[PDB]
Amino acid sequence: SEHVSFHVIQIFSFVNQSWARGQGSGWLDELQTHGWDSESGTIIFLHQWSKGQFSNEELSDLELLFRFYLFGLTREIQDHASQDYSKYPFEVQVKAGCELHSGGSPEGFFQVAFNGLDLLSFQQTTWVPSPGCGSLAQSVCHLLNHQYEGVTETVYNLIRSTCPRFLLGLLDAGKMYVHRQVRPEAWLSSGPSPGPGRLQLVCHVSGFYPKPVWVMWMRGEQEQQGTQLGDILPNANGTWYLRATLDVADGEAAGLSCRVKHSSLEGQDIILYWRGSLVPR
Amino acid sequence: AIQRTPKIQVYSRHPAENGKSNFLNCYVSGFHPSDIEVDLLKNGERIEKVEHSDLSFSKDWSFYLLYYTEFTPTEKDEYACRVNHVTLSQPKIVKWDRDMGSL
Ligand SMILES: CCCCCCC[C@H](C)CCC[C@H](C)CCC[C@H](C)CCC[C@H](C)CCC[C@H](C)CCCOP(=O)(O)C(F)(F)[C@@H]1O[C@H](CO)[C@@H](O)[C@H](O)[C@@H]1O
Ligand SMILES: CCCCCCCCCCCCCCCC(=O)OC[C@@H](O)CO
Ligand SMILES: *[C@@H]1O[C@H](CO)[C@@H](O)[C@H](O)[C@H]1NC(C)=O
Ligand SMILES: CCCCCCCCCCCC
Numbered sequence: 001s002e003h004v005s006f007h008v009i010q011i012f013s014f015v016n017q018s019w020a021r022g023q024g025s026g027w028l029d030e031l032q033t034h035g036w037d038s039e040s041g042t043i044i045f046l047h048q049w050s051k052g053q054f055s056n057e058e059l060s061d062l063e064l065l066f067r068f069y070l071f072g073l074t075r076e077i078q079d080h081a082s083q084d085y086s087k088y089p090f091e092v093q094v095k096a097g098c099e100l101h102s103g104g105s106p107e108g109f110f111q112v113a114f115n116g117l118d119l120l121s122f123q124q125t126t127w128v129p130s131p132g133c134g135s136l137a138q139s140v141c142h143l144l145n146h147q148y149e150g151v152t153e154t155v156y157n158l159i160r161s162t163c164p165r166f167l168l169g170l171l172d173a174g175k176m177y178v179h180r181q182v183r184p185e186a187w188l189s190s191g192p193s194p195g196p197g198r199l200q201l202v203c204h205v206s207g208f209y210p211k212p213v214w215v216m217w218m219r220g221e222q223e224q225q226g227t228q229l230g231d232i233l234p235n236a237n238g239t240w241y242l243r244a245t246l247d248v249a250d251g252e253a254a255g256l257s258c259r260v261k262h263s264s265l266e267g268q269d270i271i272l273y274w275r276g277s278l279v280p281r
Numbered sequence: 282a283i284q285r286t287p288k289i290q291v292y293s294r295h296p297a298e299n300g301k302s303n304f305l306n307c308y309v310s311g312f313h314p315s316d317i318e319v320d321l322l323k324n325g326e327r328i329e330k331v332e333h334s335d336l337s338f339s340k341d342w343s344f345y346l347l348y349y350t351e352f353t354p355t356e357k358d359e360y361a362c363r364v365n366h367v368t369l370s371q372p373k374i375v376k377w378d379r380d381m382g383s384l
Contacts, residue, residue, distance in 0.1 A: 009337055011315055023315075025335035032334055091314050093342055113342045116282030116313045187296040191382040202382030206294055230384075233290055233308050234347050236332070241292055241306070243382050 005029055006167040007097035010070075015089045017078060022070050028170060030211075031238035041067045049177050053169030062162075065154075090115055098163035108159030120144075122155055181264040182239055184208035188258060188272050194247045199280040203244040203258035203272065207235055214261035215244040218271075224256070250280050285343055286368035287312035289375045291361070297354045297379045305352045305377060307362035310345035318365040321350055322374070324358060354379070 010024040026034030035044030043063050045051055051059060081087055093113040098106050110122035118130040119137050127144040129137035145152075184205045191200035205215055211232065217224040230243040244258065256278075260270040288311045294304035309319050315336055320327040331350040338344045352360055365372040377383050 009335075011336055011338075013315065023336060025337065027337065032337075035335055093338060095338075116285075116342045118342075185295060189382055190380060191384050200382075200384075202384065204292075204296075204382065206292075231290075233292065233306070235294060235306065236304070236347075236349055241294075243292075243384065245382065245384070 001100070001171060002102050003099060004167065004171065005097060005099040006163060006170070007095060008034075010094040010096075012073065012077075012092040012094075013089065014077065014081070014087075014091070017081075017083055017088075020074050020078065022074065024066075024070075028167075028174075029238075030234065033170065036066075041070070047174070047177065049170070049173035052166055052171075052173045054166060065158075092119075096159055098159055098167060100164060100167060106160065106164040108156075108163060110155060110159055122152075122159070125152055125156060127152075179209065182207060182209035183264040184213075184260065184262060184270070186258065186260050186270045186272055188274055188276075190276065191245055193281065197250045197280055199248050199250075199278070201246045201248060201256065201258075201274060203246075203260070205242045205244070205260050205270075207239045207241070208262050208264060209239045210263070211240050212263070213240070213242060215242065216259055217244065217246040218257045218259050219255055220257075248278060248280075250278075252278050254278060282313060282342070284368045285311055285313040287317065287364055287366055287373075289362055289364055289373065291375050291377050291383050293354070293377065293383065294349070299355055300353060302351055302353050304349050305360055307348040307375075308345070309348070309362075309364055311339075311343045312345075312366055312368070313343045314367070315344050316367065317344075317346070318363075318372070319346060319348055320363045321348055322359075322361040322363050323352070325361075327363070328352075 007027045008024065009027065012020060012022050014020045022038055024036035025032055033046055033050045035046055037044055096110040098108045100106050112119045112121065114133065114136065117133055119133050120127055120129045120141050127141040129141045184207050186203065186205045189202045189204065191202045194200050203215060205213065215229060217227045224246060226246045228245050230245065233241045235241050256274045258272045287309050290308045292306050294306060297303060305321060307319065307321055321331050328350055331348055334347045336344050336346060360377045362375045363372050
């Protein structure tokens with residue numbers, strides 16, 4: 001569609017020679033669409049449309065591939081760090097997936113972190129160490145490029161061929177279920193004291209999609225300088241929450257309001273009037 | 282990397298109305314490593330039935346989670362989010378408050 005991404009996220013925690021945990025999920029931009037069952041090693045389809053347009057045969061093969069990859073990764077890593085390597089515990093993060101850009105080619109990527117630091121990434125046919133993570137990254141890349149050579153071609157085809165085709169199907173399958181525009185609710189409250197002789201007003205805007213939104217405090221038609229947008233936080237099922245606050249000094253006159261503009265509203269802004277006190281506690 | 286202590290933000294989905302059902306959200310973000318204990322609390326006890334996302338992470342590789350559950354706000358009842366993590370010496374508790382923006 002526009003820029004839209006599909007991401008598989010994996011987290012491997014290695015606790016000792018005999019214990020590790022794998023965890024994984026699939027995300028359509030900011031909406032989780034897939035989980036992973038770590039007990040039985042299977043894909044969890046979180047929505048009715050999470051299979052996209054893939055057949056059960058294709059998804060069976062993909063589930064097997066994932067099991068093979070995860071068991072082999074665990075086995076190899078645990079083999080190479082034996083008994084008393086002071087590295088334990090450590091954690092490996094993997095971000096792999098694809099992006100569609102409107103009118104241009106898709107992009108595929110496969111990035112790895114060791115203990116939260118960039119380690120290596122996959123570059124079309126080669127594992128390339130991050131220039132920042134030194135000797136360990138070089139050793140891992142040696143093994144991946146020379147020993148497991150015959151799976152490079154899989155990774156490439158997975159992230160650059162299979163992933164875009166799947167994402168296109170997923171987007172198409174969600175069209176009978178998912179909203180492209182969700183309207184927010186909004187309400188007013190007070191906030192914590194900004195200081196003596198002052199109070200804080202809060203305009204809450206909850207449950208809107210997509211993410212771009214405009215919110216300002218107003219005196220009639222005059223936008224107020226003290227308006228400040230908070231961080232935008234997630235809600236359930238890929239929607240968003242925002243707080244817009246205003247600091248007010250003792251002596252400000254009644255008649256303030258909050259005005260919310262959003263594409264889901266399309267010409268009918270929400271306007272909320274403050275009906276409480278403006279005398280600071 | 283360096284260990285990163287989690288940031289905790291608490292907020293309700295709908296305007297708070299005593300005796301009317303609502304949803305309580307807790308967004309925990311920016312932390313590393315991934316081992317974490319997040320609970321939503323009603324009067325200091327963990328709510329046994331909650332919804333949570335899977336772990337995701339930002340592009341600095343730090344993790345984030347979203348928790349939410351149904352709840353009915355009340356004069357007496359205290360609802361909160363409790364987090365423990367290796368960067369924390371004991372569990373950190375962030376209370377939900379109407380008279381503030383739960384800010
Ligand atoms: C925690 C897991 C993730 C969570 C899942 C969450 C759910 C998931 C989001 C659901 C969405 C599905 C979408 C469509 C995914 C879209 C693409 C994604 C971006 C790609 C991400 C890259 C993946 C992760 C890495 C695997 C590559 C590995 C290096 C290759 C394995 C090589 O193994 P292999 O040797 O080549 C063999 F093929 F297995 C052989 O096959 C024979 C069979 O007959 C067998 O008998 C032989 O012995 C042998 O095993
Ligand atoms: C059925 C598939 C078989 C394998 C699955 C694919 C996973 C392969 C990944 C191998 C990773 C191995 C990591 C090795 C780490 C290491 O060897 O460390 C080097 C030190 O010597 C640093 O100096
Ligand atoms: C490895 O860690 C797991 C999880 O803490 C523990 O149950 C197990 O006893 C440990 N194994 C050894 C050999 O220490
Ligand atoms: C000592 C442990 C090194 C960590 C190895 C991580 C390599 C992940 C790349 C797997 C791609 C198939």
